């Protein structure tokens, strides 16, 4: 492996943009909830994930 | 292996854009609830996922 | 391999856009739920997945 | 004139909307050159105009 | 003139929304130029205009 | 004139937004130039105007 004249982005996350406004969320009765907003995730090398949002509830009532 | 001269973007995630605006959102009655906005990921080498999002529930009533 | 003179994007997600306005989502009685935006997955190598994103349930009333 | 139990919107304007992306404009050899985007304009009781884009020109070459 | 019980939006601009992304604008020979975005104006009693944008120009070359 | 109960939102502007990203704006030979983005105005009795831009030029070469 050699770069003799290079410019080499790898797992790279640039120039992203978010503009929320007057928004709404609401959650009531939720056994297990998750909610996000933005997520920049880069890696070059990965054995597992990138990004992991699991949920698990319940409700009887 | 080698880049004498070069540009090489490998992996990448550039120039998103989100523009939300007034939006609503509910969950009432849920066992597990995921909720995301922007998730922007990029590797370069994975054994994985690049985005996991799972939700197991349950409702009696 | 190799590049003398190039320019070579591999695996890329650039110059994405959304506009979401006066929208509306509602979940009222699920066992599992997963309600997602924008979702830029990128990769050079993967032995698995870019986005999963999974969702079982029950509701029995 | 009176309103007992009323809702009158009278010269409104409300719920615009404008995405533009990637566009070009271009003006060259003009006299005189007038380029709008979005113009919302609203009146109740109006002795004139609401929008008014002149332009006089002369190219000679 | 009168309102027991009302809601009177009178000359009104509300809720406008605009979303432009790389655009690109030139003017290069111009006696006189003009360029606007958004403009939003709102009145309820006018004895002239809105909005007036002119240009008077000349070009000889 | 009277208002016994009443909302009356008389030459109003609101609720305006503008999102500009990446854009690009040139003028390279131009007599009088006039360049704008937001230009929110609001009366409620006027004799003249709302918003002028003129632009008066002149290129020999």
């Given at each position: 492996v050699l770069y003799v004249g290079s410019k080499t982005k790898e797992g790279v996350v640039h120039d992203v943009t978010t503009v929320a406004e007057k928004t709404k969320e609401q959650v009531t009765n939720v056994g297990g909830a998750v909610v996000t907003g933005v997520t920049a995730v880069a890696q070059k090398?990965?054995?597992?994930?990138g990004s992991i949002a699991a949920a698990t509830g319940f409700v009887k009532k």
């Open positions: 090398t990965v054995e597992g994930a």
